[PDB]
Amino acid sequence: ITGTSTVGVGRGVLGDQKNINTTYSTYYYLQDNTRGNGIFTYDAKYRTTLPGSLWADADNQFFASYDAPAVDAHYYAGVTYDYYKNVHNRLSYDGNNAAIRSSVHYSQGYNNAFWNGSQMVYGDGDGQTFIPLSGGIDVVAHELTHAVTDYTAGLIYQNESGAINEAISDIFGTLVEFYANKNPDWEIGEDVYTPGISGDSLRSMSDPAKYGDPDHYSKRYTGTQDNGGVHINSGIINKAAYLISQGGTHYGVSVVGIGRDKLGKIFYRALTQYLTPTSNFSQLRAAAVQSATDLYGSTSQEVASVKQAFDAVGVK
Ligand SMILES: O=C(O)CCNC(=O)c1ccccc1
Ligand SMILES: [Ca+2]
Ligand SMILES: [Ca+2]
Ligand SMILES: [Ca+2]
Ligand SMILES: [Ca+2]
Ligand SMILES: [Zn+2]
Known part of the structure; x- marks a missing residue:
């Protein structure tokens, strides 16, 4: 969306506080304009329609339990972008700063995460086998790297x-x-x-x-x-x-x-x-x-x- 770049604060899945890049236009959206053509995090609202809705928050504070998977999907997509850019001189997964899209709260009790050809998708887990999967930076980077492979070696x-x-x-x-x-x-x-x-x-x-x-x-x-x-x-x-x-x-x-x-x-x-x-x-x-x-x-x-x-x- 069009708006102004802002900095929200929240807690991730493991209870750690972190700052997140957001965009303000009436609501604060999980839209990080500081990296390439943007990092965009969506709520799938426990359904399997994708991507769902661009994540909107009224006050730019993301400390609710429901917020945690989104905070980490968004933040760790940023870290992964920075790795590829700073370590390999690669701008996003296509090499041309493609927008990075993620959805969280996919399905109900979904013990997995994936790249669907166009975006990353994270289940919440069932609380026994997994907790929300975007809480693992290696999982987020594993998924974004499928996009890198798809655009490179294939x-x-x-x-x-x-x-x-x-x-x-x-x-x-x-x-x-x-x-x-x-x-x-x-x-x-x-x-x-x-x-x-x-x-x-x-x-x-x-x-x-x-x-x-x-x-x-x-x-x-x-x-x-x-x-x-x-x-x-x-x-x-x-x-x-x-x-x-x-x-x-x-x-x-x-x-x-x-x-x-x-x-x-x-x-x-x-x-x-x-x-x-x-x-x-x-x-x-x-x-x-x-x-x-x-x-x-x-x-x-x-x-x-x-x-x-x-x-x-x-x-x-
Ligand atoms: O290959 C994929 O991306 C889909 C299968 N999922 C995984 O490999 C996985 C990795 C870490 C944590 C949970 C699941
Ligand atoms: Ca809030
Ligand atoms: Ca364990
Ligand atoms: Ca690990
Ligand atoms: Ca570790
Ligand atoms: Zn994989």
């Missing part, structure tokens, strides 16, 4: 290309969580998963096997569930990414870590310059090796470590 969401699509969203979800630097880890969804259980998460990049996901190509899933295992086989690539950053010895193969920033530069370059819609895991290894060669040189430690990591997970 990895088809099935089988190995789909498991790479998934791992790219877990990788950059995690690097955005480290960028924001509030309790960062290599786990996915821990801030919003199972409020009655501490220390768990939906997936782990450091040890995918903790939640039944493969950590080696010989354990890949080849059935038809889950679009051919895209949230399962993503563990093989998530483990490779973790080893490139952090190092380790995995099934006897040692990897020298090169740290998160270099992981991000290598996988950002692979995603935007080498991967294609039908890339498989072997092709991802070649893309990552070439990206590391462009950035660091063919005889570099970085190239060696990429090779070691994919060797450690059985991807040639």
Whole structure:
């Protein structure tokens, strides 16, 4: 909407106070004009019509329990924008400052979040398996990164290309969580998963096997569930990414870590310059090796470590 840029204040899902960029025109709307062509957060009002209504508030204070998922969707979309712009010189998900749209309160008790081809969507959870999913910065950044992939490599969401699509969203979800630097880890969804259980998460990049996901190509899933295992086989690539950053010895193969920033530069370059819609895991290894060669040189430690990591997970 047309109006003037303002700064509201509220609390997120986990009870933390934060400032949010709003727009005033009779009401205060969750419309952040400070980033690209705007960040816009909508209320789906427990229904499944999208996007729903641009979020409107009478006094620019967002401390109601009902407000919390919107505060965090809006704020964490901003953090994710800032990561891509400041770290990768990428302006929004299309590279041309596309408006970022999110809806919260989608459906009733909905234990998930997604990118629907046009916008991010967050359930509230059922309060047992999940609390409102926009409370996890890694979830918000995972979803926005699906939009980045769709505009870049375009990895088809099935089988190995789909498991790479998934791992790219877990990788950059995690690097955005480290960028924001509030309790960062290599786990996915821990801030919003199972409020009655501490220390768990939906997936782990450091040890995918903790939640039944493969950590080696010989354990890949080849059935038809889950679009051919895209949230399962993503563990093989998530483990490779973790080893490139952090190092380790995995099934006897040692990897020298090169740290998160270099992981991000290598996988950002692979995603935007080498991967294609039908890339498989072997092709991802070649893309990552070439990206590391462009950035660091063919005889570099970085190239060696990429090779070691994919060797450690059985991807040639
Ligand atoms: O792939 C998607 O975006 C849809 C499936 N959802 C997830 O992967 C997820 C991640 C973190 C927390 C909750 C759900
Ligand atoms: Ca209010
Ligand atoms: Ca965390
Ligand atoms: Ca995490
Ligand atoms: Ca938990
Ligand atoms: Zn995903």
